[PDB]
């Protein structure tokens, strides 16, 4: 009675970042992830009869580390039936949609707080910080103009954010924006919004929010956003009051986001004699680290 | 045979509340179903070694037991074919409806009754009690200065549901909205809410006209509202005068309403030689609990 | 001969009600269909083995006749060859074309007559009255002032009536609205309220200048529609003042309106001695019946 | 050998340059390629009156010469795995990609020192000196009608320039027009100007900003573009202050540009004891020469 395709199955069918993130496992024992960032890899052209410049440039090699782990723990009493169908099936489908909410979230806290990543002089040559753009869209509006008002400031804010990281070498096909549910109520404008195309793969065929085709990239309204408070995966995650604001958030496929999972999916069973219950329990290890933090246009939008 | 699919085809299409609810059935010959309230609990994080916080179990046993049969008497005279195909179908459809219609009564039923729980006095951390927030909307004569006044109230009074049970852990996107006829009707004449909402989600699953992406949420027009004072399903389902004010709910579609059928859709044809008739009838046997009731935001219109 | 199959396939292609109304024949040589509307109730929960259920009575039906048959006469005189000088076949779709003609338009006429309907015998509460709106059109002067002004209550009306039906459960899929010519022409001139989401730009699988999304439902217009005071279908179809009034109708495509074919096309060729013009008539046995009175919308303009 | 199939590969994929100048290249032992300018065969007319006239005249011949290697010399640490496929290909992708902004950026230098060449002697009526066109934009004015403004200014060079293009006998189809990053977001501003270019979305095979057919020709938005400074080519290529401000170029993908690459793409690995690395270069020889200069027009955008 293996009750972890219930789990597994909408845990690809909800995390959205299962196709907008590299994913990575860990082969060595120590839960570390060593990858290379490339500060610098320059052409040199000095090869015209003089001599060349032997000056090198050296490359940081940033590490992620798997400490905290994610588990469900669910005390189900004796006389009550796990096995049962009907009700396994429920409680699967929740722990799944629950931890693709939780990685979904720590996705969007990574990018959002590598927002103030100030390049060391190290690599500022093939690298950069990372853009704050902010706007001032005014939430409790009713008039047309006010509405109008809105919809234009978040529209300029896009182009600027998405020139921005343009203009840092970036091609335009492998661009996700993510909105949240108020940006994208807000938005007015709505170029023949895709429907599947959006990250492609399989995943969830047209499950997402419409992907309306702005400034010619795909916007995805993501629910998952950070309100206040922390995060299970560490204090490292923990929200602020600036970082609640920054809501839209553009980014690329393959160069700013990877995934290292230590530990997949496991669903344990043990018996509990001090208290009458045979607690079911299932957890996972994985970390997220932001790659490439020039690659993020996050907005941080102001009421008023 | 024809005819018991017909009734099925057109309760499966029309029920609006069928995918709203967990769908159970009982089992055993006792046609009592004992149901956990709590669904599942959150994440947490042990982080390598930390003196983990010990969480005491709070959780409840709901026990939902089917009373009353539900079914149609079809007075079909001995002269008519009963087994014509053009009447059989025919027949099929209005009593599926009506089934559909008393399904989702019922349901409804459910929610507004549920409105005040008071909190079972030993979980009150764990779970809240109901919710009753109040408008008065000046229905008569709404003109061009009041009509305003309305659809601001309706508006305000939905997002403060809305944001008091996101206060109690409750997804956004899991959250459905359904309101009365004349309630949707007051909230279509809005002048200042302008919404390009029409096309997507135009219908809440097969023909609901539904004006989704009201504050984040679908909201959708429900023609099952009650006014009278009594129900089929028995005296637990009455209505008072105060309960029949309420005209718009509030909830979430996975821990909020459970249902179960004890007997599925059965249909018999007996000879009745008092009434000199050949009467045909279908019954079942199925019973709606609303698990969690504090996860359900219920406004009740005061008018005047 | 083969004047039959023009007049056939002509009469498919231009009568609209052949797929808006349920397409009945009486196969019993007795020229009336008893057809029984329905009124059968929820009434159930048996409940307790001491309660005893009551036994309903309440019962009714209705009976249309094919009174009158309709046929066409056409004199050809002897000289004037008719056997397949290309000429049979021409005759043939103009004859389809008036026998569609006067199909639609005593349909139409049924659907006007029967907005009153007072209230049945036994004033079920199911069956509820018939619905009339009334609205004031300026389409005589039309300054660039009323050309508006009549807009707004053309789509209020619309509103009206689209909120009538929808608090007597008629689902949003099956419902059309058929509009006059001179209301059509009015309609276009301020386009804004269509919802521009032609796409096939034409009818509801009809060839007629139809908004295909106006206010939810196509809104299709009719050119064959009830202007005199006088039907061939017999006095109980003659129109009176206020009847003429009457330019758009709101329906379903499945309940309203019900008609039956006695006979069907039948074409036969008698040589007038007379007269000396050998003469071929086409006749037809029909009668249709308005089944549903409640489930209709009828709007009245009177001038301004 | 993977990672120099993964180099070259992308340099195909990314470099703009490919289609839109001719490859050649040398032969011979000496990294020279002779380049011939031929004069204008004008026609002729053998009358027998009047005698001809044999005057072979001559034409020029330019000859270019390869002299700088490129290459990316790579520090690879002792620890670290070179051949790992997961690091290896990652190494091909970036080598790839920085090589293609050089080839780009060194024929966009070329193409932009071309701008001043004067036509030589015994060449004036074939060959014209270079076209250069003044251009005045605010780039800080945001006043709406002073954003239009600039707009206009670019509108009104790039038709000069088509107007050069054409008076030279150039064909239209086979002209291509390239900005720089700000030129074509400032572009973008107003819409009125570009063209529906719904089926082309990419242009030149370029997944870059080019979906704007502005004048009849493409506008590609030529992200690796040359600033003030220098390039690894050598001394040709150091751009100045005045070249700097040539953000516009349009000219012909067939007889504007042609490159020779005297040396493949060859990658060696180096052991190199001093610094305990294993240095990985990947090394090429090219040069690009800018065949008919009178078919390349440019526009010096300053002041404000």
Not at 30 to 40: C, E, G, Q, V
Request: hydrophobic residues 40%.
């Amino acid at each position: 009675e293996v009750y972890q395709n219930e789990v597994d199955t909408r845990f690809q069918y909800q995390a959205m970042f299962l196709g907008l993130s590299s994913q990575r496992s860990v082969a060595d024992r120590s839960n570390t992830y060593r990858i290379d960032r490339l500060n610098t890899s320059s052409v040199k052209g000095r090869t015209s009869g003089v001599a060349l410049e032997p000056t090198p440039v050296r490359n940081d090699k940033m590490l992620i580390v798997v400490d905290t782990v994610l588990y469900i723990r669910n005390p189900i009493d004796y006389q009550d039936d796990w096995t049962a169908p009907d009700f396994l099936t429920e409680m699967g489908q929740n722990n799944g949609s629950e931890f693709a909410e939780v990685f979904d979230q720590a996705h969007l806290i990574q990018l959002i707080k590598g927002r103030s990543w100030v390049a060391p002089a190290h690599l500022k040559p093939a690298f950069s910080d990372g853009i704050e753009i902010e706007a001032t869209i005014d939430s409790d509006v009713t008039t047309q103009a006010g509405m109008e008002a809105n919809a234009i400031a978040i529209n300029q804010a896009h182009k600027a954010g998405i020139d921005e990281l343009i203009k840092r070498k970036v091609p335009l096909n492998d661009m996700i924006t993510l909105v949240s549910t108020e940006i994208y109520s807000l938005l007015l404008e709505h170029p023949k919004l895709f429907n599947k195309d959006w990250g492609d793969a399989n995943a969830n065929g047209y499950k997402e929010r419409r992907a309306v085709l702005m400034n010619g990239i795909p916007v995805v309204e993501c629910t998952e956003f950070p309100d206040a408070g922390t995060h299970p995966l560490g204090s490292a995650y923990t929200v602020t009051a600036d970082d609640a604001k920054c809501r839209m958030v553009t980014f690329s496929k393959s160069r700013t986001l990877v995934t290292v999972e230590a530990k997949p999916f496991t669903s344990r069973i043990w018996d509990d004699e001090q208290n009458f219950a045979n607690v079911l329990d299932c957890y996972a290890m994985y970390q997220v680290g932001e790659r490439r933090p020039d690659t993020a246009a996050v907005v941080k939008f102001n009421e008023a």
